[PDB]
Ligand binder design. Sequence first.
Ligand code: HEM
Ligand SMILES: [O-][O-]
Ligand SMILES: [Cl-]
Length: 153
Amino acid sequence: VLSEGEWQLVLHVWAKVEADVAGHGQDIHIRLFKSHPETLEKHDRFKHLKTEAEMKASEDLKKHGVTVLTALGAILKKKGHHEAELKPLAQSHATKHKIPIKYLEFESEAIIHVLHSRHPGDFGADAQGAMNKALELFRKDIAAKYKELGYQG
Ligand code: HEM
Ligand SMILES: [O-][O-]
Ligand SMILES: [Cl-]
């Protein structure tokens, strides 16, 4: 469980993400695909983006990052009360996209990296710990929904 103060730290840095959702999403995916190359293999339409400049220029990838971060931000703003928002994401990611929970951990690492790179002054130790707890809760709850649907993530 997160305290209310921890949720406030999560939502304080998230407001900074919201000043440029597209750019944060690009940086997150570029970091994810470089750090854990197996993850790019899940994205059929991004595999031909073979250099960083191609990834940054891709409208398709840019729009995808906004879709991802918007869903995550909506979940974070529920402060744990997120079953209704989480279920469709578990449904598609378990049954259509086939994303292991470990890949959600990889994406979480990239999120934390970009947040700290862009906002170090608003992403100190307490805020990092809060975001780690929030993203763990998200992943734990997704993992339970995966199993309820019959998918071992
Ligand atoms: C914070 C974690 C994540 C969130 C919030 C998230 C959210 C979303 C959302 C909202 C969509 C569009 C609707 C849907 O199909 O569900 C989506 C699509 C998708 N996601 Fe995720 N996602 C996450 C992590 C991942 C990871 C780690 C991968 C793969 C390595 C992945 C692969 C996909 C794919 C392949 C699609 C379909 C994209 C398309 O064809 O346009 N996602 N995601
Ligand atoms: O990728 O969601
Ligand atoms: Cl939440």
